[PDB]
Design an enzyme around this catalytic site. Structure first.
Site, PDB file in Angstrom:
ATOM      1  CD  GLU A 194      60.243  27.490  16.768  1.00 54.16           C
ATOM      2  OE1 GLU A 194      59.369  27.322  15.924  1.00 54.16           O
ATOM      3  OE2 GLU A 194      60.998  26.572  17.158  1.00 54.16           O
ATOM      4  CD  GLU A 223      59.170  24.703  21.430  1.00 57.24           C
ATOM      5  OE1 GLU A 223      58.487  25.722  21.692  1.00 57.24           O
ATOM      6  OE2 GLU A 223      59.281  24.217  20.300  1.00 57.24           O
ATOM      7  CB  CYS A 275      60.101  18.519  20.455  1.00 59.49           C
ATOM      8  SG  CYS A 275      60.291  19.567  18.989  1.00 59.49           S
ATOM      9  CG  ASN A 277      71.458  22.411  25.835  1.00 63.40           C
ATOM     10  OD1 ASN A 277      71.104  23.531  25.549  1.00 63.40           O
ATOM     11  ND2 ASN A 277      71.302  21.392  24.995  1.00 63.40           N
TER      12      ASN A 277
END
Ligand SMILES: *[C@@H]1O[C@H](CO)[C@@H](O[C@@H]2O[C@H](CO)[C@@H](O)[C@H](O)[C@H]2NC(C)=O)[C@H](O)[C@H]1NC(C)=O
Ligand SMILES: *[C@@H]1O[C@H](CO)[C@@H](O)[C@H](O)[C@H]1NC(C)=O
EC number: 3.2.1.45
Length: 497
Positions: free
Chosen positions: A235, A340, A342, A370
């Protein structure tokens, strides 16, 4: 082999309770003859990857939705599926008795579990850590002679990664990402907040930071672990935001571009680890396609970048076509990889919701989106958290597919774990996505892939309350007549010859 022991915590579905002597598990996989399919089913009502078999038959009795496999219409090859060995995940796992630890790692990494083949490893501390260390906290060490791995790596993460790799039959790919540099390389002299590397690309700060990656790969190599890839930074957008609370290191796309071009690209290439791939971005998908355009239209950077790592917060909206779709169209030879994911990150959502079917559905829905937009792999965040979603030195805010209760030597497998497993267990590395044509508008999420050996896998997710009658056609074999129950996920497998 052993079924789910269910337990309700008052949410929409159950967790599967495991302890030192009992965990639900599968027998070795077993593919039936041409004309037979296998189906694994999970339901909100409580079925957990239950196996049935049925016929693929010559005559089409369905009058509803038809999904036709189009094996000649070939898309991306899959790198794989896994999760992150954070300090938090490792601390939680290692607080179980050794037999319960074994059963937790088998759940993820064995053929009797869900066959993870990807582990993401933070390079030193992140928010999912009990403290704020780097590998080189002694200042003015530009040659990094005092670079070393602490206990978090040598006692927790590395032994657990060794055990994960021993359990896995599949080769496992390791991915490394840094959150922060040493604070003496940073403009703000701090692990978090708005702060970038000191000076400009090419200079002594930028070259030390590049060399820190090589030092990390060397230390892990001395412990007999090799990486598939590293990301340029976790990030990079976050370290540009004033008051950003977690460990971060700010880069504009222009600074990432020049850091890769001048420092990281050349440094890795000149090292004994030159085969390690470099992924750019490692950030939210709303930064694409802009970020890829800035880094990849520069040939001196583009030559060092193997792929684009994307994150998503499944709580939030991000249109896949305008991000993943457009990036693929502009850069069709640079792989997209979800590094990643979440859920629970919104203020009103509790961090851990034991037995949440909705959070499961958010995982499977996101994996299908995806895969339908060229992404080659999907990596969860923390492999395990405590029931508060910790430990996290800043604040608990997200869920995890396994929740560990150390006070009871027990762990809970959440719906997220099964929703992930409907992909990870049945889509080995090298699987290729292929066409699957819907005969009419529908409310299902579905994706088809072909195994390396030519066998078919289709995943069907029903996020509605209504049963949907469904036919699947394989032009080579015939018609699979089925029902997608409300709040179900199915994986279908069959031989084509
Ligand atoms: C670990 O979980 C297993 C499965 O829930 C528990 O095993 C059972 O023990 C009960 C009561 O002692 C028996 O009546 C059941 O027949 C057992 N079930 C099975 C399927 O084996 C075990 O109690 C748990 N361990 C601890 C220490 O709680
Ligand atoms: C490394 O650590 C030692 C022990 O504290 C310290 O004396 C020394 O200054 C450090 N070395 C470098 C090169 O910074």
């Amino acid at each position: 082999a052993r079924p789910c022991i269910p337990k309700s915590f008052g949410y929409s579905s159950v967790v599967c309770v495991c302890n030192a002597t009992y965990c639900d598990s599968f027998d070795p996989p077993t593919f039936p003859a041409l004309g037979t399919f296998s189906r694994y089913e999970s339901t909100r009502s409580g079925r957990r990857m239950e196996l049935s078999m049925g016929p693929i038959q010559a005559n089409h009795t369905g009058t509803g939705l038809l999904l036709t496999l189009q094996p000649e219409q070939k898309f991306q090859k899959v790198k794989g599926f896994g999760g992150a060995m954070t300090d938090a995940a490792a601390l939680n796992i290692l607080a179980l008795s050794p037999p319960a630890q074994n059963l937790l790692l088998k759940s993820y990494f064995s053929e009797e579990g869900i066959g993870y083949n990807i582990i993401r490893v933070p390079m030193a501390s992140c928010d999912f850590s009990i403290r704020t260390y780097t590998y080189a906290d002694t200042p003015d060490d530009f040659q990094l002679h005092n670079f070393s791995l602490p206990e978090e790596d040598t006692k927790l993460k590395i032994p657990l990664i060794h055990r994960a790799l021993q359990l896995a039959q599949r080769p496992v790919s390791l991915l490394a990402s840094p959150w922060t540099s040493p604070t003496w390389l940073k403009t703000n002299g701090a692990v978090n907040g708005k702060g970038s590397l000191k000076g400009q690309p090419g200079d002594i700060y930028h070259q030390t930071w590049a060399r820190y990656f090589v030092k990390f790969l060397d230390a892990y190599a001395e412990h007999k672990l090799q990486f598939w890839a590293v990301t340029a930074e976790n990030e990079p957008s976050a370290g540009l935001l004033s008051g950003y609370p977690f460990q971060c290191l700010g880069f504009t796309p222009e600074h990432q571009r020049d850091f890769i071009a001048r420092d990281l690209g050349p440094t890795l290439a000149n090292s004994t680890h030159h085969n390690v791939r470099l992924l750019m971005l490692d950030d939210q998908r709303l930064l694409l396609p802009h970020w890829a355009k800035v880094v990849l239209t520069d040939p001196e950077a583009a030559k060092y970048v193997h792929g684009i790592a994307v994150h998503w917060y499944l709580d939030f909206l991000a249109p896949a076509k305008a991000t993943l779709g457009e990036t693929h169209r502009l850069f069709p030879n640079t792989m997209l990889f979800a590094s990643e994911a979440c859920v629970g990150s919104k203020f009103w959502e509790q961090s851990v919701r034991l037995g949440s079917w909705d959070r499961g559905m958010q995982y499977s829905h996101s994996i299908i989106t995806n895969l339908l937009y060229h992404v080659v792999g999907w990596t969860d965040w923390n492999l395990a958290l405590n029931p508060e979603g910790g430990p996290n030195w800043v604040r608990n805010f997200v869920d995890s597919p396994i929740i560990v209760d150390i006070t009871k030597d027990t762990f809970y497998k959440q719906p997220m774990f099964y929703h992930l497993g409907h992909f990870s267990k049945f889509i080995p590395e090298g699987s290729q996505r292929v066409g699957l044509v819907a005969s009419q508008k529908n409310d299902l999420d579905a994706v088809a892939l072909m195994h390396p050996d030519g066998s078919a896998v289709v995943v069907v997710l029903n996020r509605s309350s209504k049963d949907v009658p469904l036919t699947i056609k394989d032009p080579a074999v015939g018609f699979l007549e089925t029902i997608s129950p409300g709040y179900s996920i199915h994986t279908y497998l069959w031989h084509r010859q």
